[PDB]
Every structure is written in structure tokens, then in C-alpha cells.
């Protein structure tokens, strides 16, 4: 199968990517993100966004919630589907926005550690 990756890990926020190849369209890879929070305070009004290179197409499904709870007591799960008709190496730019300790937090990062199985 396709191994999971840690996509992001900073400021107590961790985002894991798990992967499955679609059963409907073999050019589609279904990514399930899981966002977790190891700090003492919930991350609220949380929004994950993503963009991929021109040859790819992306569809982001509804997240399970808007709160990444403190102490790792649960996660936010959200699915991203990626269409890669020209079988190029997948890479991504993520944008994370949320409130923590009353402040607006926002980070942009690259995910350039996708496993080959995720796109070959």
C-alpha cells in the first residue's frame, strides 16, 4: 500500500496524510488528513487549504470539525482528492489558519515528501 506521511508538524499542530488509490478513477489518489493538537488549548476556527501544480486537479471535501482539540483528544479529519492524469510527482502547498490562545495564527508550507506510491 501507500505509506503515511507527516505533512506538517509545528507549534503543537501536527498534520498527518494517509493515502489510498481510488477504486473509481485510477488516476485519483484520496488523501485523508488528520490534524492533531498537543498543546493545552484548542485550535479553533481551523481551516486547511491546499493547492497543487497546474497539471493536477484537487477536490477538498468538508472537514469533520473546526476545532483541533487540546491534549490530543481527537482530530480533525478531512479528505482531499487529487487527480494526476499526467502522472507527475505530487507536491503541495498548504495553508493553515486557526485561532490559538486568542490570536490569529496562519502558516503556509510545502509538502514535498509525498511517497512515490502516491503518484506512480
Tab-separated table of C-alpha atoms in Angstrom, residues 32-104:
chain	number	residue	atom	x	y	z
A	32	UNK	CA	-7.160	11.750	4.357
A	33	UNK	CA	-5.620	14.389	6.538
A	34	UNK	CA	-5.640	14.131	10.290
A	35	UNK	CA	-4.894	17.264	12.306
A	36	UNK	CA	-3.947	16.941	15.977
A	37	UNK	CA	-3.045	19.409	18.723
A	38	UNK	CA	-0.558	18.562	21.513
A	39	UNK	CA	-0.881	21.890	23.377
A	40	UNK	CA	-3.087	22.842	26.289
A	41	UNK	CA	-5.516	24.934	24.257
A	42	UNK	CA	-7.909	24.131	21.495
A	43	UNK	CA	-7.161	25.462	17.992
A	44	UNK	CA	-10.388	26.962	16.867
A	45	UNK	CA	-11.987	28.166	13.597
A	46	UNK	CA	-9.472	25.812	11.904
A	47	UNK	CA	-9.228	25.792	8.130
A	48	UNK	CA	-6.972	23.671	5.960
A	49	UNK	CA	-6.453	24.768	2.372
A	50	UNK	CA	-4.220	23.295	-0.342
A	51	UNK	CA	-3.041	23.942	-3.874
A	52	UNK	CA	-1.234	21.634	-6.291
A	53	UNK	CA	0.662	22.267	-9.632
A	54	UNK	CA	-1.065	23.076	-12.853
A	55	UNK	CA	-1.291	19.613	-14.261
A	56	UNK	CA	-3.167	18.323	-11.275
A	57	UNK	CA	-6.733	18.825	-10.043
A	58	UNK	CA	-7.895	18.843	-6.433
A	59	UNK	CA	-11.162	18.479	-4.620
A	60	UNK	CA	-11.394	19.208	-0.914
A	61	UNK	CA	-14.253	17.663	0.991
A	62	UNK	CA	-15.810	19.009	4.269
A	63	UNK	CA	-13.721	18.657	7.394
A	64	UNK	CA	-15.145	16.787	10.320
A	65	UNK	CA	-14.989	19.859	12.511
A	66	UNK	CA	-13.456	23.255	13.037
A	67	UNK	CA	-11.717	22.571	16.319
A	68	UNK	CA	-8.453	20.713	16.859
A	69	UNK	CA	-8.844	19.754	20.484
A	70	UNK	CA	-6.163	20.180	23.148
A	71	UNK	CA	-4.262	17.192	24.626
A	72	UNK	CA	-4.635	15.163	21.530
A	73	UNK	CA	-8.065	14.124	22.454
A	74	UNK	CA	-9.276	13.801	18.833
A	75	UNK	CA	-8.525	15.082	15.440
A	76	UNK	CA	-9.910	16.889	12.518
A	77	UNK	CA	-10.256	14.644	9.514
A	78	UNK	CA	-10.693	15.986	6.033
A	79	UNK	CA	-10.346	14.322	2.654
A	80	UNK	CA	-8.560	15.711	-0.349
A	81	UNK	CA	-8.833	14.042	-3.696
A	82	UNK	CA	-6.104	14.540	-6.230
A	83	UNK	CA	-6.365	13.885	-9.960
A	84	UNK	CA	-2.948	13.294	-11.630
A	85	UNK	CA	-3.664	12.443	-15.272
A	86	UNK	CA	-0.118	13.113	-16.386
A	87	UNK	CA	1.426	11.021	-13.541
A	88	UNK	CA	3.723	13.799	-12.311
A	89	UNK	CA	5.331	13.826	-8.898
A	90	UNK	CA	2.842	15.102	-6.428
A	91	UNK	CA	3.758	18.003	-4.274
A	92	UNK	CA	1.588	20.517	-2.470
A	93	UNK	CA	1.364	23.841	-0.723
A	94	UNK	CA	-0.750	24.011	2.330
A	95	UNK	CA	-2.200	26.916	4.170
A	96	UNK	CA	-3.327	26.516	7.748
A	97	UNK	CA	-5.420	29.141	9.604
A	98	UNK	CA	-6.763	28.945	13.118
A	99	UNK	CA	-7.134	30.763	16.458
A	100	UNK	CA	-4.999	29.779	19.395
A	101	UNK	CA	-4.688	31.457	22.710
A	102	UNK	CA	-6.876	34.261	21.340
A	103	UNK	CA	-4.527	35.006	18.430
A	104	UNK	CA	-4.924	34.598	14.773
